[PDB]
Design a protein around this ligand. Structure first.
Ligand SMILES: O=[N+]([O-])c1ccc2nn[nH]c2c1
Ligand SMILES: O=[N+]([O-])c1ccc2nn[nH]c2c1
Lengths: 301, 301
């Protein structure tokens, strides 16, 4: 099976990547497929807040360390995240009500994780899912306690911790150009960057239903109009794994100059959180599915 | 699918169990299958030394806590391990050369883990893979630095930390009654128990090639002749997943009064470390394989 990462690099992009973690790399055929076919790895779960700081100051890095070392040994780029994401917060964080304390807790979490891997991580997802569907800011503990400046603070802190990393904000339901959330994140990122906030990229969490790939062809250029140096496609999977949907997403990447690459959410269908929708590029026997071969043919042209 | 755990309990045994961990419970159909069909869970990796104490005295319990909570919420028994196993040691341990220091480090590791989960764990695998294939003791850091007393110390320390748990020694290649390692572990366990060492069980790590199930019918009664209150089948998988091999292992369990149950290495073939041998009871689409149905029929007859 030809390598989608090699082929996308030949078209001028940076990577075709995949999310993984230690117990994937030691089972199935995941390591062999990643070695041959993908150019970047992300930790699925091992870098999230609940996995890395389950109680205050008690950092759990064993799983993340394994993935970083494996990637370095095998010549792969590393992306990591998410530093600030309400969905993976442990209870001790969401109980904090003092603005000074929560600011320092957020800063220490960012600084500790980024310093540990300083210079080794290409892309950090710093803030995730900060927007409501109507485009207002999501009322998470960080917004409620710190206020809207928590986003500037997070990015400023991350830039100081590792100036080499590309810093991204990420969100989902940015797959349609007419959806209010898509326009809102563009407007807010434009404003933040105009005031000097170091947001290098917007990452679109592309968890799609059948037939939604076509809309990404119009949504991704819109996200790119915010003026960040980079945009990316993250967490990609498609219910039913139709070649048409997957090829449309790949072509959206190719059409947007600032889109650096694509990361799929897993290797093989049985290891998806959405396994009954068989939404990935390899089947339960680790054979490439028609969508994989269709991407290969699209990138060869 | 009828539950092998309910059927084996109806035959007078304690459980039919499976190894798992957090990211299995959140993907595929693993949680649903475990809820319906298995009565005990073990952490595959999250309790091993390299996952729980990656630096001296500094413990990581996020993954293990998740599995213990999940098991309690779903009414499942819990087994855990391995407290002392050379294959999962961090480098900081294997570089210790002082007998008193290594003894204290080992005792602290045992006591900290077992205290955290005191009263919640049915079975602890305390020492693993302590024997060479010829029956002599494996020359790990523990044997080289502490000496052969490390095994009595480990069990004595474990009994004091949680007197409710059943304490096991485990090894592999105990599948043939005429293999030297099988008789050696019997010899040594008899001696240790005569000296008052609290070894409650021998666990046989049953990682089998095709056709090796039949030999377990003679090996397991031999293991039971050491006189421990319990024996168990652990880490069970069979290359090719022949019904004949799986049924022979199940019947060995039924034939040995002190054998309390069986634990299979995982749920579905693609998540095995030996996936190309398709050695588990569910396939890559999470359908029960012929071996599963054969076990069901064997337990009903
Ligand atoms: O692209 N990704 O698959 C991915 C997975 C988990 C993440 N956490 N933060 N960013 C992430 C990206
Ligand atoms: O039975 N088991 O699958 C199993 C898995 C991992 C272990 N670590 N210690 N004991 C273990 C048993």
């Amino acid at each position: 099976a030809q390598s989608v990462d090699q082929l996308i690099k030949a078209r001028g992009k940076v990577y075709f990547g995949v999310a993984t973690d230690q117990n994937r790399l030691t089972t199935g055929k995941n390591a062999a497929i990643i070695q041959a076919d993908f150019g970047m790895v992300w930790p699925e779960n091992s870098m999230q807040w609940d996995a890395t700081e389950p109680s205050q100051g008690n950092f759990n890095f064993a799983g993340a360390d394994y993935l970083v070392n494996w990637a370095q040994q095998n010549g792969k780029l590393i992306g990591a995240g998410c530093l600030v994401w309400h969905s993976f917060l442990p209870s001790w964080v969401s109980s904090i009500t003092d603005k000074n304390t929560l600011t320092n807790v957020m800063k220490n979490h960012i600084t500790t994780l980024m310093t540990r891997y300083k210079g080794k991580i290409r892309t950090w997802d710093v803030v995730g899912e900060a927007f409501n569907e109507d485009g207002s800011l999501r009322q998470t503990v960080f917004l409620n306690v710190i206020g809207e400046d928590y986003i500037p603070i997070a990015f400023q802190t991350a830039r100081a911790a590792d100036p080499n990393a590309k810093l991204y904000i990420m969100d989902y339901n940015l797959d349609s150009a007419s959806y209010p959330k898509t326009q809102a994140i563009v407007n807010r990122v434009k404003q933040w960057r105009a005031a000097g906030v170091p947001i290098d990229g917007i990452g679109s969490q592309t968890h799609l239903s059948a037939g939604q790939g076509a809309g990404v062809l119009q949504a991704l250029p819109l996200l790119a109009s915010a003026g960040t140096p980079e945009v990316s496609i993250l967490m990609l999977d498609v219910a039913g794994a139709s070649p048409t949907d997957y090829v449309n997403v790949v072509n959206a990447c190719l059409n947007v100059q600032s889109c650096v690459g694509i990361t799929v959410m897993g290797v093989a269908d049985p290891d998806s959180a959405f396994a009954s929708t068989t939404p990935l590029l390899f089947d339960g026997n680790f054979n490439p599915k028609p969508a994989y071969n269709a991407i290969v043919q699209d990138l060869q042209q």
